C-alpha cells in the first residue's frame, strides 16, 4: 500500500518568504504507461479540498505561479516562492498511480506574524443561566500571536480548576492571530458559594500572567 | 463549469445505513470516475473507493469491502454511495470528486454523524460584562449556545452599525452534546443604545433564537 510520508507537519512563515514541503512514497510511483500520477491538493480551511499541482509539476487552473512542484523518483517537494494569508490552508500529497490511492498527512501552513498580547475579557453567568441550576463563566482571549497559551481558573483565589473548556480558532486571514475561549462550568449553587471568580492567561507576550477577575459583591 | 452536488447532513442510529447522493453536472458523467473519499478529524483523508458510470465498474479499498456500496443513474447524472451498519469509526465527512488520473473537482462534503443521542435544541445565552469591568474604546459581548445535537449551528450577529470584530468558537463536546460561543466587539460609544442581538439557527431541530444583549 502506497505510503505517503509528508514533512513538516506544520509549518510557519512569514509573508514574502519560502515554503518547501517534502513529499516521499514508500515504492516507485511510475505508472505502465510512464507517466508518474503524483499530484497536490491544498484545503483552505472551510472547504473541500483542491487540486493544485497534477502529475509532478503541471499547475491546475487558477494556480498562481508562485507554487511550483519538482521531484523523481521518491522524493517530491513543493516549493511556495513568496507566502501570503491566502496561501493559508493544509497542503497534501498523493498518489494515483497505485490501487488505493493515497494521500500525505498534510501540512498545515500558519503565518508567522508578530507576536501580540490576548485581549482578555471575562462574563458572569447570565440570569437566564442562572435560572436552569447552571452557571457557565467564559473568558475570552482574543487576537494574539503565538498560539500557545496556558489559561487558569481560580475560585476566590483557591480552587484552581479542572471544569473547564477551551476552544481555540484558527488564524485569522486578515490579521494572522488566534483567539481562544475558556468556560468553567459550575452549578448555580456551586457558583452561588463563591465570590471572586478570576481568568489567569499566561503569554510569552508577558512576565507576568494576564489577569481577569469579576467580583459577585462589586456593585 | 463542473460541478458536483451532495445530499445535505445526516444522523443515523448505529446499526442503520445511510445514503449520499453526489449529483454531477457540467462533463460527460459516464466517461469520468467518481471517487469517494472520508475525512475524520486526525486521519486526513482516506480513499474509499470509485464507480464509473456507464460500465458500472467500482474498485473498493480492501477495508471497505462490505461497507460501501457504489452506484451510479446515468440517467440522472448521478452517483450514490450506502454505507451499511454504520459505527461510531463511520462518523466522518465523505467527499465525492471526479476521476481520471487525478481528483480534480471535489463535492461540497456531506457529513454523517452516527449517533444513539437524540436531537436538541440550544439553549443561546447572552453575554454582557459585569458591574465593576468595562471601560474602553470597545466592549466585547458574545452568546453561549449550550446544550445542542447533533453538530452545526449558524450564530449571526445583528449589531446596530459599527462593529464585526466577530469570533465564533469550534464546537465541544460536553457530557454528550455540544458547546460553542460567538464573541463580537462594538465600540462603546453606541452600546448599550444600539441593540446588539445574536441570532442561533440549528437546522437539525429547525429553531432559530434571537437574543438580546442586555
Ligand atoms: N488521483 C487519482 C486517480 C483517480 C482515478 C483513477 N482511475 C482510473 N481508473 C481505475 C481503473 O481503471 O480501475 N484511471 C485510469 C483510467 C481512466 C479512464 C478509464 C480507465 C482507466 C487511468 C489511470 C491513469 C492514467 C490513465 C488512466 C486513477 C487515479
Known amino acids: 500500500e502506497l505510503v505517503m510520508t509528508q514533512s513538516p507537519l506544520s509549518l510557519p512563515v512569514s509573508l514574502g518568504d519560502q515554503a518547501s514541503i517534502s513529499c516521499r512514497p514508500s515504492?516507485?510511483?511510475?505508472?505502465?504507461?510512464?507517466?508518474?500520477?503524483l499530484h497536490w491538493y491544498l484545503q483552505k480551511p472551510g472547504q473541500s479540498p483542491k487540486l493544485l499541482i497534477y502529475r509532478v509539476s503541471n499547475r491546475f487552473s487558477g494556480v498562481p505561479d508562485r507554487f511550483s512542484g519538482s521531484g523523481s523518483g521518491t522524493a517530491f517537494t513543493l516549493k511556495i516562492s513568496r507566502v501570503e494569508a491566502e496561501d493559508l490552508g493544509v497542503y497534501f500529497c498523493?498518489?494515483?498511480?497505485?490501487?488505493?490511492?493515497?494521500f500525505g498527512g498534510g501540512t498545515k501552513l500558519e503565518l508567522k506574524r508578530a507576536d501580540a498580547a490576548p485581549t482578555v475579557s471575562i462574563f458572569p453567568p447570565s440570569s437566564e443561566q442562572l435560572t436552569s441550576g447552571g452557571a457557565s463563566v467564559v473568558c475570552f482571549l482574543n487576537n494574539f500571536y503565538p498560539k500557545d497559551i496556558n489559561v487558569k481558573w481560580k475560585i476566590d483565589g483557591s480552587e484552581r480548576q479542572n471544569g473547564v473548556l477551551n476552544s481555540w480558532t484558527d488564524q485569522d486571514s486578515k490579521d494572522s492571530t488566534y483567539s481562544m475561549s475558556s468556560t468553567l462550568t459550575l452549578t448555580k449553587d456551586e457558583y452561588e458559594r463563591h465570590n471572586s471568580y478570576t481568568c489567569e492567561a499566561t503569554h510569552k507576550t508577558s512576565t507576568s500572567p494576564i489577569v481577569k477577575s469579576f467580583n459577585r459583591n462589586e456593585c | 463549469r463542473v460541478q458536483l452536488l451532495e445530499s445535505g447532513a445526516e444522523l443515523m442510529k448505529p446499526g442503520a445505513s445511510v445514503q449520499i447522493s453526489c449529483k454531477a453536472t457540467?462533463?460527460?458523467?459516464?466517461?469520468?470516475?467518481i471517487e469517494w473519499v472520508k475525512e475524520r478529524p486526525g486521519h486526513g483523508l482516506e480513499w474509499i473507493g470509485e464507480i464509473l458510470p456507464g460500465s458500472g465498474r467500482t474498485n473498493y479499498r480492501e477495508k471497505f469491502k462490505g461497507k460501501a456500496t457504489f452506484t451510479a443513474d446515468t440517467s440522472s447524472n448521478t452517483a450514490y454511495m450506502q454505507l451499511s451498519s454504520l459505527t461510531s469509526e463511520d462518523s466522518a465527512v465523505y467527499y465525492c470528486?471526479?476521476?481520471?488520473?487525478?481528483?480534480?473537482?471535489w463535492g461540497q462534503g456531506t457529513s454523517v454523524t452516527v449517533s444513539a443521542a437524540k436531537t436538541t435544541p440550544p439553549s443561546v445565552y447572552p453575554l454582557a460584562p459585569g458591574c465593576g469591568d468595562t471601560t474602553g474604546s470597545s466592549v466585547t459581548l458574545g452568546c453561549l449556545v449550550k446544550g445542542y445535537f447533533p453538530e452545526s449551528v449558524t450564530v449571526t450577529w445583528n449589531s446596530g452599525s459599527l462593529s464585526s470584530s466577530v469570533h465564533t468558537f469550534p464546537a465541544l463536546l460536553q457530557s454528550g452534546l455540544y458547546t460553542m460561543s460567538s464573541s463580537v466587539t462594538v465600540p462603546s460609544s453606541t452600546w448599550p443604545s444600539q441593540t446588539v442581538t445574536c441570532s442561533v439557527a440549528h437546522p437539525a431541530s429547525s429553531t432559530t433564537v434571537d437574543k438580546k444583549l442586555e
Open positions: 515504492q516507485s510511483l511510475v505508472h505502465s504507461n510512464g507517466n508518474t500520477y
Open positions: 498523493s498518489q494515483g498511480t497505485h490501487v488505493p490511492y493515497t
Open positions: 457540467g462533463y460527460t458523467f459516464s466517461e469520468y470516475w
Open positions: 470528486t471526479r476521476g481520471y488520473s487525478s481528483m480534480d473537482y
